[PDB]
Amino acid sequence: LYVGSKTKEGVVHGVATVAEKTKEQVTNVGGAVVTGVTAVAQKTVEGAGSIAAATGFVKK
Amino acid sequence: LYVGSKTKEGVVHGVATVAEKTKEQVTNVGGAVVTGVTAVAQKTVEGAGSIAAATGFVKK
Amino acid sequence: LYVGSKTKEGVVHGVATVAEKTKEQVTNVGGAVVTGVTAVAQKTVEGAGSIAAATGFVKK
Amino acid sequence: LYVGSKTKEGVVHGVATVAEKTKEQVTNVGGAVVTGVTAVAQKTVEGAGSIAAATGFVKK
Amino acid sequence: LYVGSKTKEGVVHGVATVAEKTKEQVTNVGGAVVTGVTAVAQKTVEGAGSIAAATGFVKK
Amino acid sequence: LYVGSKTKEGVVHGVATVAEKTKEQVTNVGGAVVTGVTAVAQKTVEGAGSIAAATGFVKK
Amino acid sequence: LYVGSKTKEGVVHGVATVAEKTKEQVTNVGGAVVTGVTAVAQKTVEGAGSIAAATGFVKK
Amino acid sequence: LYVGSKTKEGVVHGVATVAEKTKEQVTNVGGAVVTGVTAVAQKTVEGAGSIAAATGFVKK
Amino acid sequence: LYVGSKTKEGVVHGVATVAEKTKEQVTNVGGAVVTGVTAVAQKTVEGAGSIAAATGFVKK
Amino acid sequence: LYVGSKTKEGVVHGVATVAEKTKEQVTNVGGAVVTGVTAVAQKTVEGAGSIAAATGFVKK
Numbered sequence: 333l334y335v336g337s338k339t340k341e342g343v344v345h346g347v348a349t350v351a352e353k354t355k356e357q358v359t360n361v362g363g364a365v366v367t368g369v370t371a372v373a374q375k376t377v378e379g380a381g382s383i384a385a386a387t388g389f390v391k392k
Numbered sequence: 393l394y395v396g397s398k399t400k401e402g403v404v405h406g407v408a409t410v411a412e413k414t415k416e417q418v419t420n421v422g423g424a425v426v427t428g429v430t431a432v433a434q435k436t437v438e439g440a441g442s443i444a445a446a447t448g449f450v451k452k
Numbered sequence: 453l454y455v456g457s458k459t460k461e462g463v464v465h466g467v468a469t470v471a472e473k474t475k476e477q478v479t480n481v482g483g484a485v486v487t488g489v490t491a492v493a494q495k496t497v498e499g500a501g502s503i504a505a506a507t508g509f510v511k512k
Numbered sequence: 513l514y515v516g517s518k519t520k521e522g523v524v525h526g527v528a529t530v531a532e533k534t535k536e537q538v539t540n541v542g543g544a545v546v547t548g549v550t551a552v553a554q555k556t557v558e559g560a561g562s563i564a565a566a567t568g569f570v571k572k
Numbered sequence: 573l574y575v576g577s578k579t580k581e582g583v584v585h586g587v588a589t590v591a592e593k594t595k596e597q598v599t600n601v602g603g604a605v606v607t608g609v610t611a612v613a614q615k616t617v618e619g620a621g622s623i624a625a626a627t628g629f630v631k632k
Numbered sequence: 633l634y635v636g637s638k639t640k641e642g643v644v645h646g647v648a649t650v651a652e653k654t655k656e657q658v659t660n661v662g663g664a665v666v667t668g669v670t671a672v673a674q675k676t677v678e679g680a681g682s683i684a685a686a687t688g689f690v691k692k
Numbered sequence: 693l694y695v696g697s698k699t700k701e702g703v704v705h706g707v708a709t710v711a712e713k714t715k716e717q718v719t720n721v722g723g724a725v726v727t728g729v730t731a732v733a734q735k736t737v738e739g740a741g742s743i744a745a746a747t748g749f750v751k752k
Numbered sequence: 753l754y755v756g757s758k759t760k761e762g763v764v765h766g767v768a769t770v771a772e773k774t775k776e777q778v779t780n781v782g783g784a785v786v787t788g789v790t791a792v793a794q795k796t797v798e799g800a801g802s803i804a805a806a807t808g809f810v811k812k
Numbered sequence: 813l814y815v816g817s818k819t820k821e822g823v824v825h826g827v828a829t830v831a832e833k834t835k836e837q838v839t840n841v842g843g844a845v846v847t848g849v850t851a852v853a854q855k856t857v858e859g860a861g862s863i864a865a866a867t868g869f870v871k872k
Numbered sequence: 873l874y875v876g877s878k879t880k881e882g883v884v885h886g887v888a889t890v891a892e893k894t895k896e897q898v899t900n901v902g903g904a905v906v907t908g909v910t911a912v913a914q915k916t917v918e919g920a921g922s923i924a925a926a927t928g929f930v931k932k
Contacts, residue, residue, distance in 0.1 A: 364446035424506035468768035468828035484566035544626035664806035686724035784866035844926035
């Protein structure tokens with residue numbers, strides 16, 4: 333009870349998912365593909381956190 | 393009870409998943425493919441964390 | 453009770469999965485393929501953690 | 513009770529999996545293939561941890 | 573009770589798996605293939621740990 | 633295709649159920665108790681069908 | 693295609709249910725109790741059908 | 753294809769169930785108790801069918 | 813294909829069940845107790861069928 | 873193919889069951905007790921079939 337007796341940081345309680353009929357044709361050449369990432373929690377204190385960061389390339 | 397008697401950091405409690413009929417034709421050449429990553433928790437304090445980071449390439 | 457009597461860091465409690473009929477034709481050339489990674493927990497303190505990081509290549 | 517009487521770091525409690533009918537034709541040339549990795553826990557303190565890191569190649 | 577009377581690091585409690593009918597034709601040339609790795613725990617303190625790291629090649 | 637090539641009579645396709653925390657104290661004396669009957673199909677042609685018919689008594 | 697090539701009579705396609713915290717104290721003496729009957733289909737042609745018919749008694 | 757090439761009468765396709773924490777104290781004297789009957793199909797043609805019929809008594 | 817080439821009468825395809833923590837104190841005197849009957853199919857043509865019929869007594 | 877080339881009457885295809893921690897104190901005097909009957913199929917043509925019929929007594 334000095335930083336906290338219950339301390340629940342990255343929380344999603346209850347989800348229910350329906351997805352009946354799906355077609356998905358995916359085609360890349362040089363890029364990446366991320367499709368379904370359904371249930372996710374995240375806490376960062378000082379580090380650079382991210383979720384599903386999409387990027388094509390980096391040239392310098 | 394000085395950093396915390398219950399301390400639940402990266403939390404998702406209850407999920408239920410329905411996905412009836414699916415077709416998925418995937419084709420790449422040089423890139424990567426990530427499709428389904430359903431139940432995930434994450435805590436970072438100071439390190440750079442990520443989830444499903446999609447990137448195509450890096451040239452320098 | 454000084455760092456914490458119950459300390460549950462990377463937590464997902466209860467999931468149920470239905471996936472009835474699936475076709476999946478996958479073809480790559482130079483890239484990698486990650487398809488299904490369903491139940492996952494993660495805590496990093498200072499190290500760079502990741503989940504399902506998709507990348508195509510790196511040239512320098 | 514000084515680092516913690518119960519200390520449960522990388523935790524997923526209860527999952528149930530249904531997957532009825534599946535076809536999966538996979539073909540690569542130079543890349544790797546990861547298909548199904550269902551139940552996974554992870555804690556890193558300072559080391560760089562990862563799960564299912566997909567990469568195509570690295571040239572320098 | 574000074575590092576912890578119960579200390580359960582990489583934990584998945586209870587999973588049940590149904591997978592009725594499956595066809596899987598796999599063909600590579602130079603790359604590797606990982607197909608099904610269902611029940612896995614992991615803790616790293618300082619070493620670089622990984623799970624199912626897919627990579628195509630490395631040239632230098 | 634004369635009574636019907638696909639003939640799907642009592643049908644519920646896809647449901648997902650979340651119910652997190654429950655207390656239930658039940659007390660009867662002479663009556664019956666029905667609590668949870670979640671997934672149910674029914675077709676009757678000519679017979680008297682029913683679902684969860686609650687009745688206390690019958691005197692004559 | 694003479695009574696019907698697809699003939700789907702009692703149909704509910706897709707439902708998702710969230711019910712987080714519940715208390716339920718039930719007490720009867722002579723009557724019946726029906727509480728939760730979530731997913732139900734029904735077709736009757738000529739028979740007397742019913743769903744969750746609540747009745748106290750019948751005297752004659 | 754004269755009574756029907758596919759004829760699927762009492763059907764529920766896909767359900768997923770989450771129920772985290774439950775207390776249930778049940779006490780009867782003369783009556784019956786039915787608690788959880790989750791996945792059920794039913795077809796009757798001419799017979800009197802029923803599901804979870806709760807009744808207290810019958811006097812004549 | 814004259815009564816039906818595929819004829820699937822009492823059908824439930826795919827269910828997944830999560831039920832984490834449960835207490836259940838049951839006490840009767842003269843009545844019966846039915847608690848958990850999860851996966852059930854039923855077809856009756858002309859006979860009187862039933863599922864989990866709860867009744868207290870019958871006097872005549 | 874005159875009564876049916878595939879004829880699958882009482883069918884449940886795929887179920888997965890999780891039930892982590894359970895206490896169950898049961899006490900009767902004159903009645904019966906049925907607790908867990910998980911996977912069940914049933915077809916009756918003309919006989920009176922039943923599942924888990926709970927009854928307290930019968931006097932005449």
